[PDB]
Amino acid sequence: VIKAKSPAGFAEKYIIESIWNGRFPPGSILPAERELSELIGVTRTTLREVLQRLARDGWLTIQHGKPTKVNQFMETSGLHILDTLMTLDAENATSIVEDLLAARTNISPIFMRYAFKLNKESAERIMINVIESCEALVNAPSWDAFIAASPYAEKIQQHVKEDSEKDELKRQEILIAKTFNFYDYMLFQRLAFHSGNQIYGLIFNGLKKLYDRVGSYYFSNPQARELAMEFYRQLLAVCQSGEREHLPQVIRQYGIASGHIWNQMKMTLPSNFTEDDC
Amino acid sequence: VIKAKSPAGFAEKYIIESIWNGRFPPGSILPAERELSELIGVTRTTLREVLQRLARDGWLTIQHGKPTKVNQFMETSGLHILDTLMTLDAENATSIVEDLLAARTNISPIFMRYAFKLNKESAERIMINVIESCEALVNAPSWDAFIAASPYAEKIQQHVKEDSEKDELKRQEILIAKTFNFYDYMLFQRLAFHSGNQIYGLIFNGLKKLYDRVGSYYFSNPQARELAMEFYRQLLAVCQSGEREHLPQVIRQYGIASGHIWNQMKMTLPSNFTEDDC
DSSP, residue by residue, B53-122:
HHHHTTSEE--SSSPPEEPPTTSS--TTHHHHHHHHTGGGHHHHHHHHHHHHHHHHHHHHHHHHHHSHHH
φ/ψ (deg, to 5) at A213: -60, -45
Q: Are residues B255 and B182 in the same domain?
A: yes
In a 3-state reduction of DSSP, which class is residue B141? coil
Q: Are residues A133 and A265 in the same domain?
A: yes
- Tell me if B100 and A199 make a contact (CB, 8 A cut-off): yes
Please name the residues between 142 and 161 in chain B that touch chain A, using a CB distance below 8 Å. Answer: 158
Q: How was this structure determined?
A: X-ray
**Cα gap B247→A107, rounded to integer Å:** 17
Paired residues of A61 in beta bridges: A69
Closest CA to A235 of A94, A143, A85, A134: A134
Please name the residues between 56 and 115 in chain A that touch chain B, using a CB distance below 8 Å. Answer: 56, 58, 61, 64, 74-82, 96, 99-100, 102-103, 106-107, 110
Q: Are residues B202 and B254 in the same domain?
A: yes
**Cα gap A52→A15, rounded to integer Å:** 12
Closest CA to B220 of B259, B255, B180: B180
Q: Please give the residue range of the domain that contains residue A32.
A: 1-78
Q: Are residues A113 and A5 in the same domain?
A: no
Q: Is B210 on the interface with A (CB under 8 A)?
A: no
Q: Are residues B129 and B223 in the same domain?
A: yes
**Cα gap A214→A211, rounded to integer Å:** 5
Which of these three, A78, A102, A129, is where a domain ends?
A78
Q: Are B97 and B262 in contact (CB under 8 A)?
A: yes
B202 Cα to chain A: minimum distance (Å): 5
- Tell me if A74 and B49 make a contact (CB, 8 A cut-off): no
Q: How many residues does chain B have?
A: 278
Q: Are A10 and A4 in contact (CB under 8 A)?
A: yes
Paired residues of A70 in beta bridges: A60
**Cα gap A129→B263, rounded to integer Å:** 38
A146 Cα to chain B: minimum distance (Å): 23
Distances (CA, A) of B37 to A5, B10, B19, B55, B57: 24, 14, 16, 17, 21
Tell me the CA end-to-end span of chain B in Å, nearest whole number: 13
CATH number, domain at A14?
1.10.10.10
Q: Are residues A11 and A117 in the same domain?
A: no
Residue of chain A with shortest Cα separation from B196: A99
- Tell me if B203 and A203 make a contact (CB, 8 A cut-off): yes
- Please report residues of A whose CB lies closer than 8 A to that of B66: none
Q: Are B112 and B247 in contact (CB under 8 A)?
A: yes
Residue of chain B with shortest Cα separation from A9: B52
B63 Cα to chain A: minimum distance (Å): 9
Q: Are residues B208 and B113 in the same domain?
A: yes
Helix ranges (H only) for A21-119 are: 33-40, 44-56, 81-88, 93-118
Q: Which of A45, A78, A202 sits opposite B205 (nearest CB)?
A: A78
**Cα gap A112→A101, rounded to integer Å:** 16
Q: Are residues A172 and A257 in the same domain?
A: yes
Pairing of strands B60-61, A69-70: unpaired
Q: Are residues B59 and B167 in the same domain?
A: no
Q: How many domains does chain A have?
A: 2
Exposure class string for B70-81: b at 16+ Cβ within 10 A, else e: bbebbbbbbbbb
Q: Are residues B265 and B193 in the same domain?
A: yes
- Tell me if B78 and A205 make a contact (CB, 8 A cut-off): yes
- Listed in sequence order, the residues at least 6 apart from A155 whose beta carbon sits closer than 8 Å to its beta carbon are A182
Q: Are residues B151 and B24 in the same domain?
A: no
Chains A, B: CB contacts under 8 A, how many? 98
Q: Which amino acid is at B258?
A: S
Which of these three, A30, A51, A78, is where a domain ends?
A78
- To what resolution in angstroms was this structure determined? 2.2
**Cα gap B168→B182, rounded to integer Å:** 21
- Please report residues of A whose CB lies closer than 8 A to that of B106: 110
**Cα gap A239→A187, rounded to integer Å:** 14
Which of these three, A78, A111, A131, is where a domain ends?
A78
Q: Are residues B220 and B85 in the same domain?
A: yes
